[PDB]
Design a protein around this ligand. Sequence first.
Ligand SMILES: [Mg+2]
Ligand SMILES: [Mg+2]
Ligand SMILES: [Mg+2]
Ligand SMILES: [Mg+2]
Ligand SMILES: [Mg+2]
Ligand SMILES: [Mg+2]
Lengths: 160, 142, 143, 142, 143, 160
Amino acid sequence: MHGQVDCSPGIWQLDCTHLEGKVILVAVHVASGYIEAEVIPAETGQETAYFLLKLAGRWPVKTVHTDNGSNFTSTTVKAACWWAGIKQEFGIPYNPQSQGVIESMNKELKKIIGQVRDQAEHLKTAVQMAVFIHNHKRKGGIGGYSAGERIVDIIATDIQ
Amino acid sequence: SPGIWQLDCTHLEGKVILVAVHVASGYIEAEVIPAETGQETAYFLLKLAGRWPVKTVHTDNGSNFTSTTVKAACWWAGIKQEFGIESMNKELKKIIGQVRDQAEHLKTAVQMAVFIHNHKRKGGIGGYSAGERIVDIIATDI
Amino acid sequence: SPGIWQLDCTHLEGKVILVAVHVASGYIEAEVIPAETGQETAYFLLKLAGRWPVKTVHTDNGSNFTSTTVKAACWWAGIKQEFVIESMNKELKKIIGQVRDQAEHLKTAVQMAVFIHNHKRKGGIGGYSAGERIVDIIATDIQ
Amino acid sequence: SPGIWQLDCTHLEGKVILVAVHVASGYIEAEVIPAETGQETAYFLLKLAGRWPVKTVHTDNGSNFTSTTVKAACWWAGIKQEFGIESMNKELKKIIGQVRDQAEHLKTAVQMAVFIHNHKRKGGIGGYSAGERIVDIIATDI
Amino acid sequence: SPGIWQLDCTHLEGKVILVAVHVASGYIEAEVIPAETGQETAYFLLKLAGRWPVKTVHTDNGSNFTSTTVKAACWWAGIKQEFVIESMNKELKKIIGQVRDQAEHLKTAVQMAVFIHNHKRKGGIGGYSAGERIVDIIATDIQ
Amino acid sequence: MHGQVDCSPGIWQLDCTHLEGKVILVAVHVASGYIEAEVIPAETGQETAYFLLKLAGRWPVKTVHTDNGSNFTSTTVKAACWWAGIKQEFGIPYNPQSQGVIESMNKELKKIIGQVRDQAEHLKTAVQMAVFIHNHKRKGGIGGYSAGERIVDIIATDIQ
Ligand SMILES: [Mg+2]
Ligand SMILES: [Mg+2]
Ligand SMILES: [Mg+2]
Ligand SMILES: [Mg+2]
Ligand SMILES: [Mg+2]
Ligand SMILES: [Mg+2]
């Protein structure tokens, strides 16, 4: 939700979740809690490669963790990470409470999607709506900082 | 490396056998599990880790091996998982066929076969059984 | 002798725990079994015998321990039967309490406690773990 | 008495946490130690003693607590050991479960939990946190 | 203000010592860290923040001090960052030399020196120790 | 070896040491350096109680220090000390050089046992032999006084 205090700014986790028979690829910036999500045509390495290339063109992605889905281990994804200078790590780090960061984000996202599903004709719309709600939510964690603000602040300081 | 093992599941008689192999010595541990599930695998691995100094485990992408329960066990035990023995499964099945008739249940035959594989004199001279080798390797390492 | 082991059953939460202690080293193996029977005891014994060179097993006159099914396992495995581990049971139960909350089923808590006991370095001027002593003892015996 | 503390070791995630409790205020200091050994405990106690006026330490007969290294530290520090909190370990573990997901490593989560336990407002009004209490007790005592 | 602390790294025997001084009182905390990194600095800072009410930390622009990992700790702990302790480092190193031979590792000698500095009564007409002033200052602030 | 110049005559320390898999209970009169040792069947509070009762029947034992072994903290030992008028203290006083009096005696005794082990069929014999050698050894400390002579001299003066 609000990220992990002991993580580096270049660490991300990715995974796919499922809703209404659709595939939702989710990425989470571990240090901040910021996510990017999107319904993809098929749970393939091709679709996955595209999403990683987009993410890398906007953020300074150093390391990505994913489980061992064939889509995540495909040569298309491997090729994509290599081109983008991304170190791929297989297996989502374990956490006794959340089970895994991306894991808790998949659940949070589905929960949010359930609250606003009534205000969207298409699931794809509800997905972006939920991501918006998640990223803009501010909580006492940091003087009223949202995950969307934390990530740009974290990356900006790194740059500076 | 003395702390490296490879796990995998194999099938016989419509049943599932979880197999563990100490890469350095060829030592084996196997068991018929009621279902090819993460909780059965996590349990097996936990027993194995409390007996041998397990540091790294290599497996295929099998759902049971990529499961959270197994991930959780390795986390508590200090084991690093790796994905990516096929002959051990073969040898094991061969030995099982050899002693199958000495037991009604495959679970018993599997244990008899592990016993045989780990204690069987190799090279025509004692001291080179998979079971003697692992003990020497681990000891020469501690 | 390094081939000697003591076996006995202990109980917790109304469950039976079969415990095996390598007398010479203190190393142990334990497991919750569905029943205090020769069938369960024999199966446990056969697994144990397949990993360590067991030559002699000392147990009480427990009904499951004096079973022909356990006797057959010993015959097959070449184990001598004779009718520390007591202390070991208290020792084990103590570690289980420390990790009990940490596991859902006593089953896995027992394995956690075994792992802890075998890999914990103490005693004898504090230096080795029971898991190191058993391998050293036996390997030396082999050497 | 403001100079009395109780130490003890507790376990979580296959790791060891050394816990120190100021009996008078309930203030806590904990840390994941690499091994339940006397040198790790003596070091922890030494840091604690150079910060708080530690006069007496109560512990169980744990080998690390009955160790010479620890005995030597208490000797140099002027601390009197006593043998013979269980709830503090419980509370600590509870708070750790509450913030566990905010860190990858338990060592970080433990410190977050100590922070939380020592600074958490109690009674619905400020000034009664374990951390505020110890400081007042020690000060009212010096 | 009683919530202000100065932090900085000093070196001895090729080892890094992270030092924290409570500006208001002179009280200090120091520790040999494996590395001059934000990860080590953040962890040290989180422990410090859990025992004293830290509000502001003044450090130089040291790479480990300007790290996002240390920034995150401060965010989490509610600490303001701003980029005496210098003198404190000389002071500390001096006490370390007096007890160095007394300890095997610099690690424990640093803690011995900290203990000595905080509990030694001097200055201001000679009367209180830095360990007494910090508790009095803060508690008063609370009162 | 030759005791501590600042100790009282009623102070003793006890501990168990180990040799050839046997348990050796050792007692040392701190003021003199005099020891009594003996192989015991098991490191129990029962065996320990017996040894304390023997010691107390011969010497004016006022205070005994021992570490926290279960044998030393057992109610049998507590009961024994109470009956004998012995104050039990837990934890062997620390000494920067010897680590602890009984500690250095355990090492001295093992060293002596090692020198004469060849002249004894049984370890139990070697143990009494080593105690004899230790207690009768005289050194410049006091005009040629051995620890065996120092203790009787110390206790005698106290009585007188
Ligand atoms: Mg997935
Ligand atoms: Mg497979
Ligand atoms: Mg029984
Ligand atoms: Mg304890
Ligand atoms: Mg600096
Ligand atoms: Mg002792």
